[PDB]
Amino acid sequence: LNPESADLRALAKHLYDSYIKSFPLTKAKARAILTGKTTDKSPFVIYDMNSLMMGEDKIKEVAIRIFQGCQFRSVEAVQEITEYAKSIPGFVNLDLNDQVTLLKYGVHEIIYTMLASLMNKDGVLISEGQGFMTREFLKSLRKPFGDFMEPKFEFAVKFNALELDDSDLAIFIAVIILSGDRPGLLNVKPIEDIQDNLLQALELQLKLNHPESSQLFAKLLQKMTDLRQIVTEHVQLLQVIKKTETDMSLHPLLQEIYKD
Numbered sequence: 001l002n003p004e005s006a007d008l009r010a011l012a013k014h015l016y017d018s019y020i021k022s023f024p025l026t027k028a029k030a031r032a033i034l035t036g037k038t039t040d041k042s043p044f045v046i047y048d049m050n051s052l053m054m055g056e057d058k059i060k061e062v063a064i065r066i067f068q069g070c071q072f073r074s075v076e077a078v079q080e081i082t083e084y085a086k087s088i089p090g091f092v093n094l095d096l097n098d099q100v101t102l103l104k105y106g107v108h109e110i111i112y113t114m115l116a117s118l119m120n121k122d123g124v125l126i127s128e129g130q131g132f133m134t135r136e137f138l139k140s141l142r143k144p145f146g147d148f149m150e151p152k153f154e155f156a157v158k159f160n161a162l163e164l165d166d167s168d169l170a171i172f173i174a175v176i177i178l179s180g181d182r183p184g185l186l187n188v189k190p191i192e193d194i195q196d197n198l199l200q201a202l203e204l205q206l207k208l209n210h211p212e213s214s215q216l217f218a219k220l221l222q223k224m225t226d227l228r229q230i231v232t233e234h235v236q237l238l239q240v241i242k243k244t245e246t247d248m249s250l251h252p253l254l255q256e257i258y259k260d
């Protein structure tokens, strides 16, 4: 290690530190619950209509209720991600407008990155890990709701194969937020300078933590293309909902985000 790389390590430690402080459910905790490393942290499995009402006692119409649940957790994440953002060096010093723009386009890409930590080919964790809803149950929901989660799962399965851990992800989502190609950015240069530093930190982090993983750095940046697609698709389905479901409300915070 040299004087320059040492600064990168310092930045990684910081971000990873702020990550833990901002997200109550890390991937480490999620993988531990999902892989039987438990007896005290075993989740209740929801795989059908009956287990749904059963769990609602342990952890209108089902479909809508489930969707209303996703909303609640989304707003939660936005709040958490927004708190993590503030710890990214230089972030809060940027033009307020840009701060708003970066969160606007970055929040959902981050959510799907982290939501993968709570997934496996067969399902996803819910209620801070207390529950576990099967991929099949969600895919059987009343249309067009049964189409909501499938795309996320497909991504998660591929993304999870990279075997990244919390310390890697902490820098990675920081890179996501600080994107100079966001639409409407007033001052791009300042942002790119921060991202340039994060990328440097990520690269070193991946090299050190994943020595036998060839071109993990490059393979990880390409995943950013997968996230964009998932976001584009979500908005489309969300539009359909807005019209076929005029009696269902959407949290204003989330509304201000999709107006892109």
Ligand SMILES: CCCCC[C@H](O)/C=C/C=C\CCCCCCCC(=O)O
Residues within 6 Å of the ligand: 066, 067, 069, 070, 073, 077, 110, 111, 112, 114, 115, 118, 124, 125, 126, 127, 128, 133, 149
């Ligand atoms: C990165 C964001 C983490 C999201 C955590 C959230 O609990 C997981 C959602 C995964 C699929 C949504 C299915 C609907 C879940 C309905 C209940 C959610 C709950 O009570 O936690």
